[PDB]
Amino acid sequence: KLKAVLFDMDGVLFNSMPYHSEAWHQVMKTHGLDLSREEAYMHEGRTGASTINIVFQRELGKEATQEEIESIYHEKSILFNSYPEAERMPGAWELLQKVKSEGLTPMVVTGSGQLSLLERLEHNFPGMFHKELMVTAFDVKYGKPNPEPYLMALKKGGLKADEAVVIENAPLGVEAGHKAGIFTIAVNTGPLDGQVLLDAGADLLFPSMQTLCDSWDTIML
Amino acid sequence: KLKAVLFDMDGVLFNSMPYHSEAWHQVMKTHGLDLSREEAYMHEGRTGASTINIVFQRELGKEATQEEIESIYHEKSILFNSYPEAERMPGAWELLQKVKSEGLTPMVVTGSGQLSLLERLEHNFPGMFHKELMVTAFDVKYGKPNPEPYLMALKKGGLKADEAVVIENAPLGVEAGHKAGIFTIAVNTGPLDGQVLLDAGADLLFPSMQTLCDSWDTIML
Ligand SMILES: [Mg+2]
Ligand SMILES: [Mg+2]
């Protein structure tokens, strides 16, 4: 019997990945470094530091310094913020209402550490989440694909792994939920092949958030 | 214009694959041959003759004679029919009602020559199907994963490939639908990994007939 539902924020609650992928691609290009929009989708869920390091290690044969990480990340963040603000993923508010009406605790698990997440989550999904029942960059040392953030979600909610379900759209996020020993539902909201989500260890796979919403009662039976 | 929905029978309309897999496994075992239950699921959709020939080709390094094909097929079918009759796959009747209410033509495209199941279609799905709008083992030269049975169905229905959708549960059936150029929805109703259905060319994947039914209006929007 389930108690909690653990949502990723990017690509699950907000339709932000076109923006995250473009900004990552463009900022790398500005620095003479090659990160494709597709590879940015492959790295969804990673910390900015980790993403920057991976490109530096492959292209430059070394790690980025902390000041280079912070510089490039701030530049990516400025660019991401220059775009008209990201909107709700279709089906998210509807699934959240279903989950809540069934007595389940909605939770957010995200590697973002921005304050206005609180405001933006609350404005888009009013009454759904509680800031204390949420995992952010203020908590994440390692981040996806390490199961750390989902394990910290379990801890914060006082949950056993078999009392939760993970809703994820990205393979590093699926892998994180899976390697935490939590039942993981993949929603293929991006441009990647469904196989990549199943290969990462998803127990179920749906084509979209709305189809997950439509199917929720049936899979919970 | 979507005009018709092309259903497989076993694993889609009837929950018969536990029996089919068991019967093949056991009959082969009686004959001193190795066909596991899992491999029977992999060969779902093929003619009886092809299935038997594949085992002979691998295990004995030779083709099966026609009388070896005929005897083994006969034993397997009798064994299948010794089990309490296969019941409807949950979701199938509801989806059929929905498809028909939205003006689409239900069709059966199957590799089966199992009279006991074929002749139970009307009693299980009243007012849905018609012999003139069906393709069975009796209709084909090659069968799944040859797109031949699906192309035959399009002809029978007076349809083009972009006017139909295929609902399949088996890798060789998805392949057949895909290679005919028809939009194919895989429903993972057996014990195989979902990746094998996506790899065979499924445009969409759902874990069950009921969740497909639940999601039908959404994916057709
Ligand atoms: Mg995500
Ligand atoms: Mg089948």
Side-chain angles (χ1 to χ4, degrees):
Chain A
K1 314 155 192 182
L2 264 39
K3 288 170 77 182
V5 184
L6 288 30
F7 291 86
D8 196 356
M9 196 180 66
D10 297 295
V12 165
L13 297 168
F14 291 99
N15 185 25
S16 46
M17 287 310 297
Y19 290 171
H20 282 294
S21 63
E22 188 72 19
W24 272 125
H25 164 77
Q26 291 298 334
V27 175
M28 288 307 181
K29 179 174 173 184
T30 287
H31 294 266
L33 300 162
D34 182 29
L35 175 72
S36 75
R37 284 167 194 87
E38 183 193 356
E39 213 204 329
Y41 274 101
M42 270 183 48
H43 298 310
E44 179 174 350
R46 285 195 207 274
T47 64
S50 176
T51 301
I52 292 158
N53 272 331
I54 287 165
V55 180
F56 268 64
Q57 285 176 313
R58 182 182 65 230
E59 305 256 304
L60 302 179
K62 58 164 174 166
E63 275 192 354
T65 60
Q66 199 48 45
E67 70 167 35
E68 282 168 335
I69 281 163
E70 293 169 354
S71 302
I72 293 163
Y73 189 73
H74 181 47
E75 188 182 337
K76 182 266 167 176
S77 181
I78 287 170
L79 186 57
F80 174 88
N81 285 328
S82 75
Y83 308 146
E85 75 180 356
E87 308 209 312
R88 295 186 281 287
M89 184 65 67
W93 172 243
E94 204 195 326
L95 186 55
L96 278 166
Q97 283 166 294
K98 200 180 287 285
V99 159
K100 196 192 166 177
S101 66
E102 281 152 26
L104 299 167
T105 304
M107 292 184 73
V108 179
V109 183
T110 177
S112 300
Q114 190 229 57
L115 166 73
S116 311
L117 257 52
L118 297 174
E119 287 184 340
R120 281 218 84 227
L121 278 167
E122 188 59 33
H123 290 152
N124 284 274
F125 311 102
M128 285 306 162
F129 301 113
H130 303 289
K131 41 153 82 181
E132 61 271 6
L133 274 154
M134 280 162 51
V135 175
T136 68
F138 283 75
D139 315 297
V140 306
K141 199 166 170 88
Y142 301 111
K144 298 161 184 173
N146 196 305
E148 192 206 22
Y150 287 115
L151 296 173
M152 269 183 303
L154 291 182
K155 197 163 199 172
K156 291 197 174 204
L159 297 149
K160 297 169 165 70
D162 74 309
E163 300 175 310
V165 149
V166 165
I167 306 196
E168 268 286 3
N169 69 305
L172 298 178
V174 170
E175 173 177 354
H178 186 60
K179 292 180 175 168
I182 306 167
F183 195 90
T184 301
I185 305 171
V187 284
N188 198 6
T189 65
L192 299 176
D193 289 352
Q195 296 98 306
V196 319
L197 301 180
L198 291 172
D199 281 346
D203 293 289
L204 295 176
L205 166 70
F206 287 90
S208 69
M209 286 291 287
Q210 187 64 59
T211 54
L212 181 54
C213 189
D214 296 347
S215 298
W216 186 262
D217 291 324
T218 298
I219 61 166
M220 291 310 136
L221 276 158
Chain B
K1 279 209 177 195
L2 180 53
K3 287 154 76 172
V5 185
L6 281 51
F7 296 85
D8 191 26
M9 176 178 74
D10 298 293
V12 172
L13 304 176
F14 283 119
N15 185 24
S16 51
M17 286 307 304
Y19 298 153
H20 279 302
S21 61
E22 192 68 24
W24 276 121
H25 168 69
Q26 296 293 340
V27 170
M28 287 297 187
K29 180 176 170 187
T30 308
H31 280 266
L33 302 168
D34 179 43
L35 177 63
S36 74
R37 295 168 189 87
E38 187 189 28
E39 207 205 336
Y41 274 100
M42 290 306 286
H43 298 309
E44 177 181 349
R46 292 191 192 278
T47 68
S50 185
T51 305
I52 296 161
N53 251 316
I54 292 165
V55 176
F56 270 73
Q57 283 168 330
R58 187 185 56 237
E59 300 252 301
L60 300 179
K62 65 177 188 163
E63 223 89 5
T65 68
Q66 202 62 43
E67 73 273 2
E68 277 171 338
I69 285 156
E70 281 168 15
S71 304
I72 291 163
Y73 185 115
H74 195 85
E75 290 161 43
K76 181 264 154 177
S77 172
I78 291 170
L79 185 54
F80 174 81
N81 281 328
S82 71
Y83 304 138
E85 70 180 9
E87 294 178 336
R88 297 178 290 276
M89 189 66 80
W93 172 239
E94 195 189 343
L95 186 52
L96 279 165
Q97 288 165 286
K98 190 187 286 294
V99 155
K100 194 192 182 184
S101 291
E102 284 154 24
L104 309 172
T105 306
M107 298 185 71
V108 181
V109 189
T110 180
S112 176
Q114 195 80 63
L115 300 173
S116 77
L117 293 166
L118 285 171
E119 299 193 346
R120 277 178 67 218
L121 283 168
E122 182 53 38
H123 286 152
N124 285 267
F125 312 103
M128 292 301 166
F129 304 113
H130 302 282
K131 293 179 190 178
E132 61 269 24
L133 300 166
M134 280 174 63
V135 176
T136 74
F138 306 105
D139 295 302
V140 299
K141 196 179 175 186
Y142 308 105
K144 296 170 190 184
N146 198 304
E148 171 209 27
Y150 285 108
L151 296 180
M152 281 187 56
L154 298 183
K155 180 83 96 168
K156 283 184 167 186
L159 303 159
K160 290 100 172 69
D162 59 343
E163 298 180 318
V165 170
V166 169
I167 303 177
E168 269 281 5
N169 69 303
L172 300 165
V174 174
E175 184 174 353
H178 182 64
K179 315 265 243 230
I182 309 164
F183 192 90
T184 302
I185 298 172
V187 276
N188 198 15
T189 60
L192 304 176
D193 293 339
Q195 297 97 310
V196 316
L197 302 175
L198 291 167
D199 282 344
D203 297 281
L204 292 173
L205 173 69
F206 288 89
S208 67
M209 283 294 286
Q210 189 61 62
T211 61
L212 171 57
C213 184
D214 294 350
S215 304
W216 187 264
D217 305 327
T218 289
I219 62 173
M220 298 305 157
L221 258 150

